[PDB]
């Protein structure tokens, strides 16, 4: 019953190929609802969720303005970061950020987030107190002191406790039929001989939303974490997700193995076995 709004921004320089690309994608849980890409040919129509349509053109204008300003800010940030690390103008570099808020079933703030990474490495994060910073290195300490001087945390806190929560609640209401619907996994177990001596049991979960799921194998009721191959949860393209977990078992011993599935859309957790 809990929910999260999160923006995932990527700014990437590309010397000799124009200005850095900026893309921001906004999500409510595992549903993308907005994208702004500085390389997009015609904005709009950059994609927006249905339940965003009803917010009207003033809402679109305001967000577009923010994204355009963010594009310039991130480009300038990339220039600053190059200097902070004594880097040459020749290489490509990447600045990423995540910001947003988590709320409970009652819509109350659980916590806020605002953090960055440069070239794949954590750079600076707003702490859970929404008042202080954690800087990863002496470069990020420069950013920290600039943000302290300008009382930036206070501005981020105001967004995270105010705007973020208020709009997440709105989106949830307006999109309740989808955003507040958990679709349970459709599950089955398949059997794949490897040799005369052993076979793979694969436990499948399909068609579930949101993406969070627990899928495990037990042998005689004992967790087989070390012996389980667990693929990354993957999008199907219809909003739902898929996952499987596999174990290699000795021929004839299949009934000793049970697959266990937990997910928000299930009335209760599943226990599944191979059914030949």
């Amino acid at each position: 019953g809990s929910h999260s709004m999160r923006y995932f921004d990527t700014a990437m320089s590309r010397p000799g190929r124009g200005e850095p690309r900026f893309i921001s994608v906004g999500y409510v849980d595992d549903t993308q609802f907005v994208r702004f890409d500085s390389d997009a040919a015609s904005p709009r129509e950059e994609p927006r969720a249905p339940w965003i349509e009803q917010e009207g053109p003033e809402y679109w204008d305001r967000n577009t303005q923010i994204f355009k300003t963010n594009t310039q800010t991130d480009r300038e940030s990339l220039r600053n970061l190059r200097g902070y690390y004594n880097q040459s103008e020749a290489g490509s570099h990447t600045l990423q950020s995540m910001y947003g808020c988590d709320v409970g079933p009652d819509g109350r703030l659980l916590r806020g987030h605002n953090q960055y990474a440069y070239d794949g490495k954590d750079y600076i994060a707003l702490n859970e107190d929404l008042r202080s910073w954690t800087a990863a290195d002496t470069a990020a300490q420069i950013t920290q002191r600039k943000w302290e001087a300008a009382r930036v945390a206070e501005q981020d806190r105001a967004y995270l406790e105010g705007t973020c929560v208020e709009w997440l609640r709105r989106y949830l209401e307006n999109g309740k039929d989808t955003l507040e619907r958990a679709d349970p996994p459709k599950t089955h177990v398949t059997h794949h001989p490897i040799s005369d001596h052993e076979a793979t049991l694969r436990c499948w979960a399909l068609g579930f939303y949101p993406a969070e799921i627990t899928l495990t194998w037990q042998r005689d009721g004992e967790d087989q974490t070390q012996d389980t191959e667990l693929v990354e949860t993957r999008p199907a393209g219809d909003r739902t997700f898929q996952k499987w977990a596999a174990v290699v078992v000795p021929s004839g011993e299949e009934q000793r193995y049970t697959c266990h599935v937990q997910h928000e859309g299930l009335p209760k957790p599943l226990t599944l076995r191979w059914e030949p």
């Binding site: 923010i66 910001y99 981020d156 705007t163």
Partner: peptide, 8 residues
């Protein structure tokens, strides 16, 4: 709703 980002 997006957030204004600050210069690093």
């Amino acid at each position: 709703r997006a957030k204004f980002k600050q210069l690093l």
